[PDB]
Nucleic acid binder design. Structure first.
Length: 37
DNA sequence: CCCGCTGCCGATTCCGCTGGAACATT
DNA sequence: AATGTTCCAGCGGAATCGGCAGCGGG
C-alpha cells in the first residue's frame, strides 16, 4: 500500500471496529464474571 | 480515525552587557 | 551646568527540556 491516506482510512474503519469491540467486551465482562464457572 | 514514538524546536532560566534615564556634586 | 556614578531596562548567548508536529503501524 503506497497510499498513506487510503491505508489510514482503512484503519479508520478498523480502529473504530476495535474501539467498538473493546467497549462491548468491557460491558460484557461484568455479567460474564458474574455468572462464570 | 487511532496509537505511538522520536526528532526538534520552541521557550525558560540564567547570566552578562549595553543603553538610557536619573542622580548628586563644584 | 558638566560629569561621573548609580540604577533601571532590554537584548542575547547557552543550556535544558518539554511537547508539538509529522510520520509510520495498528
Amino acid at each position: 500500500m503506497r497510499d498513506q491516506e487510503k491505508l489510514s482510512l482503512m484503519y479508520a474503519r478498523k480502529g473504530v471496529a476495535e474501539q467498538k469491540r473493546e467497549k462491548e467486551i468491557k460491558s460484557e465482562l461484568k455479567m460474564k464474571q458474574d455468572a462464570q464457572v
